[PDB]
Amino acid sequence: LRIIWGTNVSIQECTTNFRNFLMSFKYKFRKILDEREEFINNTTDEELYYIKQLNEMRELGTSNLNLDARNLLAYKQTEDLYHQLLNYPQEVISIMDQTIKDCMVSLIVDNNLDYDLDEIETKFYKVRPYNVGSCKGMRELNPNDIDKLINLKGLVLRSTPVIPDMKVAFFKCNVCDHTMAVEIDRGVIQEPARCERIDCNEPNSMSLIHNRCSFADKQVIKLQETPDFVPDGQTPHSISLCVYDELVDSCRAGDRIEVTGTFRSIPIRANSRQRVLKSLYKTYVDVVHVKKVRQITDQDLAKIREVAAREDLYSLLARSIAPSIYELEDVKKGILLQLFGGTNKTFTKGGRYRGDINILLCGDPSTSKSQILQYVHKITPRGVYTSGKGSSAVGLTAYITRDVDTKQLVLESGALVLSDGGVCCIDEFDKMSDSTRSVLHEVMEQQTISIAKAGIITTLNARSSILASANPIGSRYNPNLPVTENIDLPPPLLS
Amino acid sequence: ALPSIQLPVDYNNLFNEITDFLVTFKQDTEKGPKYMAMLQKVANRELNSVIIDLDDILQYQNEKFLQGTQADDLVSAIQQNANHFTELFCRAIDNNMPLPTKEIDYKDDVLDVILNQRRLRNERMLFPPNLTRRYFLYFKPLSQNCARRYRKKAISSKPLSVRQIKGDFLGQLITVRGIITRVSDVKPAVEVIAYTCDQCGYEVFQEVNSRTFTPLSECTSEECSQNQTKGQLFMSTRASKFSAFQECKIQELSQQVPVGHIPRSLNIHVNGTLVRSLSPGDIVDVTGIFLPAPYTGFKALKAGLLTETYLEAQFVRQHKSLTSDVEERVMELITSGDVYNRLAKSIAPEIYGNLDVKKALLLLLVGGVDKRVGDGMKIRGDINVCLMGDPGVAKSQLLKAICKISPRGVYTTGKGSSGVGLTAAVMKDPVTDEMILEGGALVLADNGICCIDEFDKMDESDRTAIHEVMEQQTISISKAGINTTLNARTSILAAANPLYGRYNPRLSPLDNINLPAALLSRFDILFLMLDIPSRDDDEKLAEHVTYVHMHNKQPDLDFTPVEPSKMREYIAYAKTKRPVMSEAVNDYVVQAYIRLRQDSKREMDSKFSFGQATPRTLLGIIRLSQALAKLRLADMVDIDDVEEALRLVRVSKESLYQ
DNA sequence: TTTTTTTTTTTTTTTTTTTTTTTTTT
DNA sequence: AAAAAAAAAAAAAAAAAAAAAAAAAA
Ligand SMILES: Nc1ncnc2c1ncn2[C@@H]1O[C@H](COP(=O)(O)OP(=O)(O)OP(=O)(O)O)[C@@H](O)[C@H]1O
Ligand SMILES: Nc1ncnc2c1ncn2[C@@H]1O[C@H](COP(=O)(O)OP(=O)(O)O)[C@@H](O)[C@H]1O
Ligand SMILES: [Mg+2]
Ligand SMILES: [Zn+2]
Ligand SMILES: [Zn+2]
């Protein structure tokens, strides 16, 4: 009956439509909707996709939903919500959570089991809609769609630490020591006027206790427009993203993500002191769903065992690692043996004994060693493929550098430390400088790197394996001359 | 206090004449008024902009002159002052707005819902008109043709420059010719702000006519008149009206700058549907109102009476596909015949000779097959052509000329600027002082040609990027904590300068230039153009050069210069085509390669040849056959195509002596 | 071998001005 | 209601000079 002020959304019909949608929907209605021909109806029409996810969530206890927009449009009666959500996301989502609140009860008591439901009552639920509409870049956003759900795509540049946000203030009285909590609305705190205690009742006797309040977590992300869609002679644009609650610390730096969220615009103050504002707002998005671009099962164990029971396991993974490479089976044998490595041990008296295998490939200049290295790069779990042509003399180890965003100090590890426990591939070994070479010498001898700069003295762990590829001087490796002259490498390093 | 002055202009008669012009005006050449048609079109939620023509206003004045009754020269009043006539015309439009004739179509418009909800409560139990407005009003400058038709001269549409804009033209409608250099993103600017008041009365509206404002934060309604302290106003974005705003900078053209001076710049502000009409790098003629900025805030005190300025834009005039037409153009060029030779020849018709180089530049313009093999293997189809030779052989016109043919191309030069390897992750942009990931020139040209002039003097820092592109075509990015890899598939056209002058009877080609052997091996083709003195060739070269100086036209000859747009149309169409190969064709390639290798084993000699053949040579043979097949043929490649590719490679190889 | 050559690395802010707009204070 | 006092508002940065290293050669 009554409608929330401003909008046209009413809870009464929305709740009923949603419950009908959930208990009624199947893949049958979905495949009737899309009906793109060659659509499979093999028992999927009666699978009850929503109810099975609902039950598996109830038994798991996790609160995560992936409601889609096309599926929401599939049902005829709930088609209203499709156009009623794009324009009023917040209120529709509020109805969403309120209906999911009793979606639990609708299924826990169907057989009248002994589920507590008290932890269900305490916990809250929400939704993560995706594929709301056609994806449009940030270069086409008008003020005509403020406070409306959109889907954006872009490169992640950076993230900020967790930001506290006050929810419940906490005031103490400096005379009678009475504690009272005041909720804040939209940021502004309504100050208590005088102490509620009628006996105390003193004007101007309030003190704020900062560490006794209640806070929630925020994160801010920075996006950049993808180079593919940019036109000629332009500079990429940027958008700031607000992330709350469980989605915080999800987007790593440098990834490319497609997100769903509400566009918003806020004013920013002209003068820091005065109340005055300037007639130009800033635009950002509050995100609700993010998508990007171990624990092996027992069946995996069984298949691993039966494959390991093969008559000749050596040759099979000899040929698998480099399918393109023809012949050169012996180097593949060596690399396959290297990728496992002998056992590692460190007994108290003698000390640690190495268990890493180092391999150097060299010879005539137009063989296929670089492709071999790029092949072994992918197979190994943790490894780095960087050429030795140049870069810093400690570019493979720690390098104390000044932070760019903040005028602070950061200790950044190198490529040998970042290949700990794996295989590190070095390309163009012959161009590596005389001063940085010694660094590798301490890596291949003691497997540790020590840095003593800017008041910091410390040691890291290398424990990696070196596979390198080099080129000679000239267009051929003449067998008559020995190895030393051609390869231009110190005898100990080759040894 | 404030003294008073008498001015001839009276706005009452002006408003009367605007009302008369909106109704009466008819196009003399649908029937009826010209503008009440488009107003009815607007009322149906279809047209978002209203554009007035001063030619049409002159037509109404001329009609009245035909009747003979006096007029108020509305066209001159608009030119002299235009910031007030916009509001006058907006009010005139609002008064005579036609009713919605069809398809009311109220679906989910938030402002519509708010306005409809207002009616019930207000009637059961005056706002700024601009809130209900949707159309945007723009003026159109005068036309010299219509002006010369009725004299009266013209000032608003004359193409002035940035420098010719004096302080006497402020507050008028003028036009400026220049090139756009910087354009910013679109942001919302508030026009009417609505505050919600704790269920006190109802939301209040305030208009903003400046760049800076103050919130109300006090409820003055009759129900809100009660004395109890109750709370301030909170802004509501949904009930507020925004507008699209954009700012750009226009710079004076090099032709119009006097000697010894530095070009100036002008600022342009655009609001409404006209946004996004201008992009960087465009030479345009922009009309608008020239207005003074307030310059307030900090650093205003020192100026005192000095002001900024800007131009509110209202019109844009830019100076400068699969269809049956382009379907027939390619057929016409096919029927023309001699596509190979004519295409090579028409490239830079000024330069006489070096015809094989012109054949190879065509193959570089087209691209070979890029096939993604399974299990991670990839093969490149891009072309790497390096042109070496003595100075003063037309080294650096040839290159520049090739850049014209393909739109996706960048001409990068020596250490004067760093663009080859500038894949930096830091950008100190003055507008916001935050980092922006900035790609280099190699990344910028995707599916394009990178013309690297003076490649000898370019530093090893760029040599790293050149080395990596030819290997994997994926640029790794700077170490500013982003760990990004960017696609950089591109073709390379390099121009070289031999060490200490010209060719030297030193036998090794490696001795002639500094470039490493590994770097040169990745190049698909190497061309040596040595300047050898011959008495016959100098005569024709001198005659060809001097004919251009005597008569600016190039020397007329039986050779026909094909039209450049046809060049581009055929090149693009060939690029879209995808060849395919057969098992029989590639069998002869093995015999060719084994013969080449059996030659190379004994080809090692004192002077001729560069090292020995490599499987990369076999790969480049197929890669070059790709372009020669794409040139005219389709589907399976001809056997003679391999012969043509081999011939071109062999001529390039034999260029070492020549 | 001891000469020449070469990159390169912080060096930077301590000051300003009279309005204009805010809070205290007789 | 009418005075006297007190801060915000900075922003900015390239272009040149001097000194110590880490690579080149008669
Ligand atoms: N075959 C030719 N046809 C026409 N003009 C030519 C030819 N060869 C050289 N030129 C002349 O050479 C000039 C163009 O090349 P230019 O000498 O300017 O540059 P470059 O070859 O890159 O040499 P540099 O090393 O001096 O920069 C023009 O004067 C042009 O007339
Ligand atoms: N044995 C081989 N098997 C397959 N391809 C080869 C072989 N030898 C050479 N090639 C070809 O030659 C090229 C070798 O380049 P690469 O080895 O990466 O350069 P680099 O000599 O710098 O390591 C590859 O493109 C590859 O296709
Ligand atoms: Mg030149
Ligand atoms: Zn108290
Ligand atoms: Zn009120």
Q: Angle, nearest 10°, between helix axes B395-405 and B355-365?
A: 30
Task: Tell me how far apart the alpha carbons of residues B469 and B440 are, in angstroms, rounded to a whole number.
Answer: 12
Cβ atoms of residues A395 and A414 within 8 Å: yes
Burial annotation A73-99 (CB, 10 A radius, 16+ → b, else e) = ebbeebeebbebbbbbbebbbebbeeb
H or E element in which residue A217 lies: strand A214-224
Cβ atoms of residues B646 and B622 within 8 Å: no
DSSP B447-478: SSEEEE-S-SSS-HHHHHHHHHHHHHSEEEPP
How big is chain B, counted in residues?
658
Cβ atoms of residues B491 and B448 within 8 Å: yes
H or E element in which residue A402 lies: strand A399-402
For ligand 1, atom 12, the nearest C-alpha belongs to B394
For ligand 1, atom 13, the nearest C-alpha belongs to B394
How big is chain A, counted in residues?
495
Give chain D positions with protein CB within 7 A: 8-14, 22-23
Q: Does B3 touch chain A (CB under 8 A)?
A: no
Q: Search chain A and give the residue with CA nearest B425.
A: A157
- Compute the 3-state secondary structure of chain B and give helix, strand, coil in percent, each to the nearest 5: 40, 20, 45
| Cα–Cα–Cα angle for A40, A41, A44, rounded to 5 degrees | 110
Task: Tell me how far apart the alpha carbons of residues B280 and B287 are, in angstroms, rounded to a whole number.
Answer: 17
Cβ atoms of residues B247 and B308 within 8 Å: no
Q: DSSP code of B421?
A: S
Residue in B451, B446, B424, B426 with CA at minimum distance from that of residue B436: B426
Sign of CA dihedral A94, A96, A100, A106: positive
Task: Tell me how far apart the alpha carbons of residues B57 and B173 are, in angstroms, rounded to a whole number.
Answer: 15
Interface probe for B, chosen from A475, A476, A478, A488 (most Cβ of B below 10 Å), is A475
Question: Which residues of A belong to the annotated binding site?
Answer: 363-370
Looking at B422-563, list the stretches that DSSP marks H as alpha helix, in order from N- to C-terminal side.
Answer: 441-444, 460-472, 509-512, 517-522, 535-550
CA R_g for chain B: 34
Residue A280 (CA) to nucleotide D8 (C1'), in angstroms, measures 22
Residue type, A183: E
Give chain C positions with protein CB within 7 A: 17-19, 21-23
Task: Tell me how far apart the alpha carbons of residues B162 and B263 are, in angstroms, rounded to a whole number.
Answer: 9
**SS3 track for B74-110:** HHHHHHHCCCCHHHHHHHHHHHCCCCCCCCCCCCCCH
Q: Determine whether the distance from the CB of A273 to the nearest atom of strand D is below 7 Å.
A: yes
Cβ atoms of residues A323 and A375 within 8 Å: no
Two tokens, residue B363:
């193959």
Task: Tell me how far apart the alpha carbons of residues B216 and B193 are, in angstroms, rounded to a whole number.
Answer: 10
Resolution (A): 3.3
Question: How is domain B323-652 classified at the CATH fold level?
Answer: Rossmann fold (3.40.50)
Q: Determine whether the distance from the CB of A271 to the nearest atom of strand D is below 7 Å.
A: yes
Ligand closest to B221 (CA) is: 5
Q: Determine whether the distance from the CB of A276 to the nearest atom of strand C is below 7 Å.
A: yes
Residue A272 (CA) to nucleotide C15 (C1'), in angstroms, measures 21
Please state the atom number of ligand 2 nearest to the C-alpha of residue A368. Answer: 17
Please state the atom number of ligand 2 nearest to the C-alpha of residue A428. Answer: 22
Q: Does B429 touch chain A (CB under 8 A)?
A: yes
Cβ atoms of residues A355 and A344 within 8 Å: yes
Q: What's the Cα-to-Cα distance from B534 to each of A229, B497, B530, rounded to whole Å?
A: 53, 22, 12
Place of tokens 């193409």: B159
Nucleotide nearest to A273 (CA to C1'): D8
Which residues are bridge partners to B495 per DSSP?
A: B387
Interface probe for B, chosen from A238, A367, A375 (most Cβ of B below 10 Å), is A238
CA atoms within 13 A on the CB side of B137: 18
Which residues are bridge partners to A448 per DSSP?
A: A461
Which residues are bridge partners to A278 per DSSP?
A: B212
Contact flag A281-B242 (C-beta cutoff 8 Å)? yes
Burial annotation B133-152 (CB, 10 A radius, 16+ → b, else e) = bebbbbbbbbeeebbeeeee
Q: What is the dihedral of CA B128, B131, B134, B137, to 10 degrees?
A: 40
Contact A326 CB / ligand 2 (< 6 Å): yes
Q: Search chain B and give the residue with CA nearest A366.
A: B614
Task: Tell me how far apart the alpha carbons of residues A29 and A76 are, in angstroms, rounded to a whole number.
Answer: 10
Looking only at the bridges linking them, the beta strands covering A465-469 and A359-361 are: parallel
Burial annotation A362-390 (CB, 10 A radius, 16+ → b, else e) = beebbbebbebbbbbeeebeebbbbbbbb
Q: What is the dihedral of CA B67, B72, B75, B80, to 10 degrees?
A: 170
Place of tokens 């295409």: B343
Task: Tell me how far apart the alpha carbons of residues A27 and B159 are, in angstroms, rounded to a whole number.
Answer: 65
Task: Tell me how far apart the alpha carbons of residues B414 and B420 are, in angstroms, rounded to a whole number.
Answer: 9
Residue in B473, B474, B519 with CA at minimum distance from that of residue B496: B519
Q: DSSP code of B274?
A: T
Two tokens, residue B388:
């070496």
The phi and psi torsions of A128 (rounded to 5 degrees) equal: -130, 80
Two tokens, residue A358:
């180092």
Sign of CA dihedral A147, A152, A158, A159: positive
Q: Which residues of A touch B244 (CB under 8 A)?
A: 142-143
Which residues are bridge partners to A410 per DSSP?
A: A401
Compute the nearest-CA separation of B435 from chain A (Å).
9
Cβ atoms of residues A281 and B190 within 8 Å: yes
Task: Tell me how far apart the alpha carbons of residues A114 and B138 are, in angstroms, rounded to a whole number.
Answer: 72
Q: Search chain B and give the residue with CA nearest A323.
A: B375
Cβ atoms of residues A233 and B439 within 8 Å: no
Residue A401 (CA) to nucleotide D18 (C1'), in angstroms, measures 25
Of B189, B376, B377, the CB nearest to A378: B376
Q: DSSP code of A206?
A: E
- Which of left, alpha, beta for A353 (phi over 0: left; psi -120 to 50: alpha)? beta
Solving technique: cryo-EM
Contact flag A280-B187 (C-beta cutoff 8 Å)? yes
Of A155, A224, A253, the CB nearest to B481: A253
Contact A315 CB / ligand 2 (< 6 Å): no
Burial annotation B646-656 (CB, 10 A radius, 16+ → b, else e) = bebbebbbebb
Q: What's the Cα-to-Cα distance from B288 to each of A73, B78, B93, rounded to whole Å?
A: 47, 12, 21
Residue type, B232: Q
Reduced to 3 states, what is the DSSP secondary structure of residue A471? Answer: coil
**SS3 track for B257-287:** CCCCCCCCEEEEEEECCCCCCCCCCCEEEEE
As to burial, measured by CB atoms within 10 angstroms (0-12 exposed, 13-18 middle, 19+ buried), residue A471 is buried
Reduced to 3 states, what is the DSSP secondary structure of residue B286? Answer: strand
